[PDB]
Structures are given as C-alpha cells and as structure tokens.
Symmetry: C3
Amino acid sequence: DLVRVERKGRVTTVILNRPASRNAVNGPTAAALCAAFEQFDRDDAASVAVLWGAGGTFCAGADLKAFGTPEANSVHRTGPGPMGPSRMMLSKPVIAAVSGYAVAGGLELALWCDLRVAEEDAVFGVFCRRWGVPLIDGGTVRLPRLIGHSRAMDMILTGRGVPADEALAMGLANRVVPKGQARQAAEELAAQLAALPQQCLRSDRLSALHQWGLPESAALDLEFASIARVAGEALEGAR
Amino acid sequence: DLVRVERKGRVTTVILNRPASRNAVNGPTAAALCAAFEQFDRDDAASVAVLWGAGGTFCAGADLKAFGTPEANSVHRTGPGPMGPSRMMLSKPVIAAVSGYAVAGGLELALWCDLRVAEEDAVFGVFCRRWGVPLIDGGTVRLPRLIGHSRAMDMILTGRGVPADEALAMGLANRVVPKGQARQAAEELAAQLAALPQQCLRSDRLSALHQWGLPESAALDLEFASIARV
Amino acid sequence: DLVRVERKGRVTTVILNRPASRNAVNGPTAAALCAAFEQFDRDDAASVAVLWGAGGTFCAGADLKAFGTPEANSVHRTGPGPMGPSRMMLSKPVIAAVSGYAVAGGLELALWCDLRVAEEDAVFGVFCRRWGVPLIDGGTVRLPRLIGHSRAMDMILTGRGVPADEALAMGLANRVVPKGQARQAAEELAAQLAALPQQCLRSDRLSALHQWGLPESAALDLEFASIARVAGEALEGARRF
C-alpha cells in the first residue's frame, strides 16, 4: 500500500511506497504518514524512527498529478500539513534515510527529520521552484536554521540540486554512506540512540528545537526544566 | 554618475561608480543607491537586481573623509541607513557581484543582498573594527544569521579579512568565479532566477527572511500564507 | 586552589585547576568561576578574558562524584547556573583555550565563550548523553546558534566526540593550534582584541548576541544604538580619514 511501518526493537521505520511516482505524496499518503508518526509518538516501546523511501528515491514532493482530484493534498491552516507530518513536533527523534532525490516537499520532510543520512548519489533540492508550487511544509523555516540563511537562500532561490557531498559540507547531510546503504546506516544510528538514556536525550532535543525564536533568557529557562523532567534518570547517572 | 543603473531584460544592475574612493559611499551616493533600489522594487518589469562595484572593487564602506562636510553619510534612527538601502526589505532579490574588497559598510551591503558571487581574489571583512566605527547597517544582525554565530563572532571581533575561498567554505560567498567575472556571473544567475515562476520565488524568499525571530510554530503559520498569495 | 586568576597586560586568564578530576566543576569551583568573571566584568584594566583548564584538559563538566556532598553543584533556576558563569552576559569577550576534552558542562562553558581556540588533539562532545545527565548550562541553546541546527542535533543526540579538525570545519573551533599551545595562542589572540578600539568592539559583540530571536527591523534598531554608545570613539575614528 502507500506507507509501511516496520519495527525492530525500539526502532520504527516508516516507509514511503509509491515508487511509480518517485514517492510523491498525495492526500491519502500524507494521511498514512501522519497516522504512522502519531502512532510512533504514543508508542512507549518505540524510541527512534527512521523515515525511508523505498524504490531508490526518498520523496519527490507533492503528487502534482493528483491536483484537483479527490486524492489531492489537503491544504488547511490547522491539522496536518500538506506533506503529512511536517507540522508535528514529535516527542522522539526521526532519522531521514535519504536515497536518490529528496526534493520539494520531499526535501521538507527530510528537513523535518532530526538527522539526515544520505547515500553518495543523493540529491537535495527545492525543485518546486521550477514549477511555481510554494514551500508550505516548513522548508523556508527549517532550511535557514539548519544550514544558515546564505546557503538556504541559494537553495531556495535557484531550486538547484545539491549533491550529497556538497550537502555534507553544508551540514545539510549529517552522514554520507554508499548507494543503497542509507536505510541500514540510519537504522544502526537509530539503535545506537535507542540504547542511550532516553529522557535526557529527549528533553535535550526538544530544548534545541524550541530555543529557535526565543531570547536566550527564556531559552535557558526552558532548557533548565530538563533537570526536573529527567531527575529519576540523572540520579541513576551520578551513581 | 555616483551610481549607474543598467537593465538587460528583467535584470537591473545597480553600479557603484566611485572607483577612485574604492567605492566608498558618502551621503549622496547612499541616497542614489536608495533611489535605484526603490525604483527596482516598484518596477513591475524588473525581477532581479545585481549590485556591483565598478573598477575592480565592491565597496569599502562609508566615506569617512566626507565626515564633517555636506557630503557626509546621514545617520538617523529612521529612514535610510547610512550606507543607503541596508534597512530595506525588498519584494525581490538582489545578487551582490563582489570583486576586490567588500569591507565595513561594504560588507554590510553585501550581506544585505540575497546571494553573493565573489571573484577568487575578493576579500570580505569587518574592517571598521580597526578604525573604531560601528556596524550600524545590519552586519551584526545579518552575519550571524548567514553563517552562524561562531564564525560571525570571529569576523566581527577580529575584523580579519576573509578571502573568497574561506568565504565559500563558511557559506558567506555563494559562488566563487575568476577575476573580472563577478558581474557577468551574477547577471547570468540573475537571468536564471528571472526565468522561474516569480510569485512563488518571492514568497518563499520573504518567508525565509521573516522566520528568523519567530519560534517554529508561529513561523510555520506565517509561511502557510504563501498558499494565499501565489 | 580550585580556580586561579592571572593577569597579563589587558588579558585576564581564568584557570580551572583540578586536573586530577579532569577539571570537573563542583559547587565551590563554580562559585569561584563566577566570582572571577564578575570581577573581570568590572575591572577597567582588563579587556578580554581567556578560560583555560590546567594540566592537559579543558573541563569534563559537572563533578558527579560530589552529588550528595556539601560540594555538590548548585542547581537553581535563577542566579548562577550549575557550571558557574554560563548564564552571564559579560560586557567583554572571553576566549576558550581548549586542550584535551571539553565535554558535557565543559562543552557548555566553551560554547558560552565568544571564540574557541582548540589544540589539534582536543575533543568536544556532549558526553553527558552517555550518563543520562541533561544539558542545563545553555548547550541546547548555544550550539544550534553557533553551528546550525543540523550539526548541533548530531552532536546533541549522539554524544559523539568531535575532534578539533572536524570542529574547525563545522565552525565550532575558530582556531586550531598545536598541542600545548591553546593557552598561549588564546592569550595572544586576546591581546589582539584588546588592542582594537574597545567601544565599537564591545557594542558590536553585544548587538550580535541580542539580535537572536528578533525580527530584522527591531534587531536593526538595537544595533543602531551603538552609535550613541560609541559616539566619542566613532568621532575619533572619523577624524583619522
């Protein structure tokens, strides 16, 4: 069907499965992506998710051929974003395992992930620039935060394909692995993260995400709450 | 004569034209840059601008010799900044075509631009650090956003010259081209941008600018107005 | 003594001096670090500070062995942070001179400094990730602003050690120097900073710090106040051309 979910211990892999359309995401696919990540989020046995496109490419963005059919992307001010989970701030991390193209709304999904493991011949890019479809799944918010305003404006204005090696030098890809290996390497990294003390990891991440836009004083006070949140685990740390 | 404007289709090139003062910007030059950008912003036939300094150099900053004279930079809390257009948020992008030095206020004009195409030989730097004149044309605001706080603080505190290759690795230069090619490479990049669908390009650009200083959720709310506009 | 303070010209060096604990910071160490920096902030004879760990390593973070002793770190929502000066906004810059490990709370002290000079074999890392102790001295705030969110999230999630050369490529280290030379190289760079016109330098720096979080138009207004703060120096600067 459209999205598959697989689990191995505390790692959940969410798989986009529309290879005939280069994993473009239409309305029902966006809903299945949301359902999958909502379930991951409430599942206390799952610690880390991996997002992966089956078929050799990650995600080509919104399914243009579905424009004005009943399968079109949902576009509303509240509820899920058009690409599915792009507005959610999950309680636990997601690693993107990027093969082939992560472009347009597919780039937005990769940016919504906490880390990106890219294959050597992967390409990241704002390819919706060529066809006049806007970034409305957070790309204009997240890209500049991730890699700095200058590099981000370069990608956003030109729409150019950034290859994996350049993405690694920009900090857009966090790891670059051989062709075919992103899923496995993402899943290995995920399992490593799952084996660390979880409350503290989780609270640190959400502090990193929430600090953007905040003044330092407030961001420091948000962060400080971690010690009360994880106090159980931090006790077991001093030991 | 202080500033020339040349058009090629939907690309307007604004040219700083005081090579004998290393393209330092005094009060009248700043006013002329403002007027040229105001006109570009209002011009429905112009899509992308290029900012380029004639005669081998981009801009060495404020014309400090003009201080105390009627040609002195105007320094006021509102209206144009001292270098000219550095407080404007344009509806459309500008590419800086950097040769030679982009220093002090000249670095601030380059940071105000959306993209920077630099020549191999070009140097970027906070050289006003050495002279004891403050950055008040957005350098302290824009540089950390462009390349991160750590690198920006190195540049700002030290005032060191950053050559084009280092600038490209920091993300400060977007493109590096051979000596004398900055104008042409910028104009070519501009024409490529002018050939894409424009409403969506301009919308995405403004959203990337405004998100800084909104937290995530509010910034996502704001970007979602692009759906309305275009 | 837990912390030593030495003055060389206009450069004050604050020295973490517990090499047998890998320069872990307990309660009384943190209090001595705050006092050293508060004294710096008000000393008109000092322009720039350097923070340096003695004995081969920068700082291993909070002193976990001291939890439940009278020397435990003070952990309170207001006032000084648990590592000591990590919530202070100083009026003057501080350069971290990193040898060996700057990890956990030690990384956070290095992040709190304006610039980092690292030895070629130094390592930066969120090592508290392994022990399950949270970052509460500003690491989750400052790391993303310093190096971007993607690279910061890598370091924060994994807890991996980032060697000096990779740290230089990420923008986390600003300078990389040979083994044994962090202190001297940081002090030399500090003396360079101290030789520049100090009012513009200090205002530019604070504008760069306060702009984070602000829309550009308000941030430009804050920056514009520099000209009133530094008018005497800027007038002198103008008159030399």
